Amino acid sequence: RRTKRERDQLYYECYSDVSVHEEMIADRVRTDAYRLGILRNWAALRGKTVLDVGAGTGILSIFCAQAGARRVYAVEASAIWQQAREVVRFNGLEDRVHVLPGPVETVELPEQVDAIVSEWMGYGLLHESMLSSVLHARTKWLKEGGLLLPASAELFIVPISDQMLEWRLGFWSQVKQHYGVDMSCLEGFATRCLMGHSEIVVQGLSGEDVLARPQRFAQLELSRAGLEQELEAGVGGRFRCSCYGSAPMHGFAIWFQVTFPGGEKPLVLSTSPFHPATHWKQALLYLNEPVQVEQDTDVSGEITLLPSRDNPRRLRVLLRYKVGDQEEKTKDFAMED
Amino acid sequence: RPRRTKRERDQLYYECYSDVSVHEEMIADRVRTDAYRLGILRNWAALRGKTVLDVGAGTGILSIFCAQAGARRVYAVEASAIWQQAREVVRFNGLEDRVHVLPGPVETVELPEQVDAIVSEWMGYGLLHESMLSSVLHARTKWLKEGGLLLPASAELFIVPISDQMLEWRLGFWSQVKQHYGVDMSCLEGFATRCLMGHSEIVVQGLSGEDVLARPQRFAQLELSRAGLEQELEAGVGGRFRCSCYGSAPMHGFAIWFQVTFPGEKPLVLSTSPFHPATHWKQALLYLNEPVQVEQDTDVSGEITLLPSRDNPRRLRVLLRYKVGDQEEKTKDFAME
Ligand SMILES: Nc1ncnc2c1ncn2[C@@H]1O[C@H](CSCC[C@H](N)C(=O)O)[C@@H](O)[C@H]1O
Numbered sequence: 001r002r003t004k005r006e007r008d009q010l011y012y013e014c015y016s017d018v019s020v021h022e023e024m025i026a027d028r029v030r031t032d033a034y035r036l037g038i039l040r041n042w043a044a045l046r047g048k049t050v051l052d053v054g055a056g057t058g059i060l061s062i063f064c065a066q067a068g069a070r071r072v073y074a075v076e077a078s079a080i081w082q083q084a085r086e087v088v089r090f091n092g093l094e095d096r097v098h099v100l101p102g103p104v105e106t107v108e109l110p111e112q113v114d115a116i117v118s119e120w121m122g123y124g125l126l127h128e129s130m131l132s133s134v135l136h137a138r139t140k141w142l143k144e145g146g147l148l149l150p151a152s153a154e155l156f157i158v159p160i161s162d163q164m165l166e167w168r169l170g171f172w173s174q175v176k177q178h179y180g181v182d183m184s185c186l187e188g189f190a191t192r193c194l195m196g197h198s199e200i201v202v203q204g205l206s207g208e209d210v211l212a213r214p215q216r217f218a219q220l221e222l223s224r225a226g227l228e229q230e231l232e233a234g235v236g237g238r239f240r241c242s243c244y245g246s247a248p249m250h251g252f253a254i255w256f257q258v259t260f261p262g263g264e265k266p267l268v269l270s271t272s273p274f275h276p277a278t279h280w281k282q283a284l285l286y287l288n289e290p291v292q293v294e295q296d297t298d299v300s301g302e303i304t305l306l307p308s309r310d311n312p313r314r315l316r317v318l319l320r321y322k323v324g325d326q327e328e329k330t331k332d333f334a335m336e337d
Numbered sequence: 338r339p340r341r342t343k344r345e346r347d348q349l350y351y352e353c354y355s356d357v358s359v360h361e362e363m364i365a366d367r368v369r370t371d372a373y374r375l376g377i378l379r380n381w382a383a384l385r386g387k388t389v390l391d392v393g394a395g396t397g398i399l400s401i402f403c404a405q406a407g408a409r410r411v412y413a414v415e416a417s418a419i420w421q422q423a424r425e426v427v428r429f430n431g432l433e434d435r436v437h438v439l440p441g442p443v444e445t446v447e448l449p450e451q452v453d454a455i456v457s458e459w460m461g462y463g464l465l466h467e468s469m470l471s472s473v474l475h476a477r478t479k480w481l482k483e484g485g486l487l488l489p490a491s492a493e494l495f496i497v498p499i500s501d502q503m504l505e506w507r508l509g510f511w512s513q514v515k516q517h518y519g520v521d522m523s524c525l526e527g528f529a530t531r532c533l534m535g536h537s538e539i540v541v542q543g544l545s546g547e548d549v550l551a552r553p554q555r556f557a558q559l560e561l562s563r564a565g566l567e568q569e570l571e572a573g574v575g576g577r578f579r580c581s582c583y584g585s586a587p588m589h590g591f592a593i594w595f596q597v598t599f600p601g602e603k604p605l606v607l608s609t610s611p612f613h614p615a616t617h618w619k620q621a622l623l624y625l626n627e628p629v630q631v632e633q634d635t636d637v638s639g640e641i642t643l644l645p646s647r648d649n650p651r652r653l654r655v656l657l658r659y660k661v662g663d664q665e666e667k668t669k670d671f672a673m674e
């Protein structure tokens with residue numbers, strides 16, 4: 001029964017709480033990437049004007065002030081804007097950073113800007129669907145030739161064997177050795193419960209969980225004309241890879257990176273399991289049950305990321321896949337609550 | 338609260354026990370599962386050739402422990418769909434003539450006879466969350482023979498003031514931002530305090546000795562054979578407490594926890610204390626709206642009541658009144674997260 005005004009109310013109220021901003025600012029990989037991406041673009045920002053789309057606690061806007069921006073419009077729709085105003089005033093930057101309450105779509109800036117900065121990425125890159133707000137701002141408020149930070153995003157997929165899941169499935173066969181009762185027969189049940197659902201699971205993996213070379217399946221250049229329409233229809237594509245070895249394959253992980261223009265050279269913020277952990281972790285797409293793979297087992301497929309039917313802020317993933325000689329299968333996932 | 342009928346609430350409660358994760362967590366809790374295993378086997382003399390009712394058999398584990406103790410017949414009653422898994426575990430262990438899995442609530446299930454003993458793991462967070470105890474007492478009245486065994490036989494509830502070191506780290510986070518990022522966010526401590534302490538939810542979290550500010554106090558004792566215990570549960574259980582603080586510390590509120598006792602041999606105690614080995618129950622934390630500074634010998638006293646919530650009688654409510662030093666008496670009314 002959820003309307004657009006109610007959905008947006010609930011979405012923004014979630015960002016009014018401290019925990020989510022604590023988690024974001026405690027993410028050093030994330031927050032340093034933005035700090036360093038901003039400072040490397042000093043030449044484009046010094047004396048110039050910036051729009052921070054979704055300013056939160058104000059931190060990115062203040063990085064921009066510190067890079068030399070003449071003025072920063074810190075726009076924020078959640079009640080956290082009040083915290084941002086307090087932080088700006090506390091750092092003595094009222095004259096340089098103007099906190100503006102409300103959605104960026106309807107906010108009134110006194111001028112167009114030279115640059116946009118935004119941390120808009122959700123789980124699986126596109127959960128929350130905030131990118132359309134950034135693009136709306138770009139069209140409405142960014143000067144011709146202005147700077148967009150980050151400037152692009154890329155999506156990757158790979159087959160995985162999730163070590164933690166494997167222990168959880170193996171648990172039931174270990175009951176006998178712990179307590180002298182054989183519960184190995186609940187393995188099928190544990191599998192139905194943990195793998196047989198159609199939810200995207202957000203969980204951090206290591207490189208040892210990755211079974212093949214990761215494949216890029218989409219590239220999003222934020223300045224590309226028609227990107228809004230692509231997001232609505234769905235982004236993605238085909239992939240193919242070969243497994244390294246014997247492993248119980250559980251499904252796929254997806255992740256992203258975003259890239260900032262260089263000064264210097266281009267800075268990449270990555271959420272790969274081979275790279276230092278971030279609060280995004282990776283987004284796991286589990287098969288209904290494990291499939292044993294071997295060295296050189298072919299894994300192919302096709303994936304589309306799109307907004308859900310009944311909630312446009314909820315990521316949906318449509319997956320088609322083939323593991324070795326098993327027939328092609330499909331699975332339709334939605335982001336877990 | 339959005340209105341649900343009794344039948345609907347009960348259905349949602351049992352459906353949550355139909356999933357593997359809670360049973361994995363319970364069985365992985367070695368402290369819990371070995372307490373019952375040993376509590377049952379120590380009572381071999383009262384169980385040899387005798388009949389047992391397992392109230393809320395789940396995956397069937399306690400019922401099988403009872404059969405292993407020499408029980409002649411065990412009735413494994415389970416209202417959640419997990420009864421199907423119990424039935425299969427029993428068959429797989431070759432115990433189908435001794436352990437009989439019976440589906441449905443213990444309140445309406447028909448046994449062929451009264452029993453010599455009841456075993457049940459009925460304890461929720463803060464002991465009484467879920468309100469399962471009344472079902473065990475219902476089964477005692479209806480099915481347990483006069484002089485019959487009850488496992489466990491009693492429960493006790495404890496309270497102590499705490500300085501949560503983890504919470505103190507989270508509140509101090511905003512003062513550490515300048516060091517990492519060159520942006521001063523120390524002014525958000527107040528906001529973080531309102532968010533993390535100002536709510537009225539019971540927070541379930543594992544503490545240790547370093548978090549405890551005084552000698553723990555027992556505030557209630559529940560003897561399961563006591564007449565009219567059912568009525569006490571509905572009216573609320575609890576009592577007054579007092580203690581004296583050990584040293585200087587920001588007091589954040591209180592922790593409560595419980596233990597239950599099995600008849601011996603000597604008597605086995607399953608404890609959920611922060612000074613004892615960790616369990617899945619952790620402790621239940623009752624935060625004040627903001628920290629209060631205490632000193633050595635600061636008097637902390639009050640009265641605490643645990644009772645069903647009004648809208649959901651399976652949700653634990655806690656009525657607390659307390660006084661720290663010469664601060665005025667305060668009250669706070671909590672509900673389980
Ligand atoms: N259309 C919109 N207009 C304004 N703010 C928005 C928005 N959509 C999302 N937001 C806000 O954008 C923020 C994304 S999280 C990023 C917070 C902050 N920039 C930081 O880096 O720490 C949230 O605070 C959310 O409420």
Ligand SMILES: Nc1ncnc2c1ncn2[C@@H]1O[C@H](CSCC[C@H](N)C(=O)O)[C@@H](O)[C@H]1O
Pocket residue numbers: 351354360363364392393394395396397398399414415416417419441442443444458459469472
């Ligand atoms: N009134 C009732 N009748 C039957 N089962 C009940 C019940 N109230 C709760 N239960 C069940 O009691 C169990 C409590 S959890 C304990 C599970 C199992 N005995 C073990 O020790 O691992 C749950 O499976 C729950 O569904």
Ligand SMILES: *CCC(=O)Nc1cccc(-c2c[nH]cc2CN(C)CCN)c1
Pocket residue numbers: 349350351352353354358359360362363458459460461462467617
């Ligand atoms: C499933 C119904 C329900 O809400 N149960 C509930 C609520 C909170 C936490 C748990 C839980 C989580 N892990 C294990 C358990 C059960 N545990 C508290 C022991 C119960 N006898 C369950």
